[PDB]
Amino acid sequence: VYDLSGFTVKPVATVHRRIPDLPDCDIDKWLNNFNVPSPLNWERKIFS
């Protein structure tokens, strides 16, 4: 009597959930701003 390698039931489909209608982060508009700071005064922006 041989106990074979354990099988797992494979996924039939995939579920993907995300919050809809969220705005674009516009990260490029902030990184491309021409008023570039020096390392001494590095600027910060938080994207949420």
Partner: protein
Amino acid sequence: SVGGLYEIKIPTNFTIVGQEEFIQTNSPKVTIDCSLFVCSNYAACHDL
């Protein structure tokens, strides 16, 4: 011994006592699929 005789307590009445004793002769036959235990179904783990 007094006069070659010794004092001894000899039973004048008796009962039967029952004492149970469990002796383990077997145990749960544990089996492990080492591959399914170590790696679940992740192919990246099974390769290693």
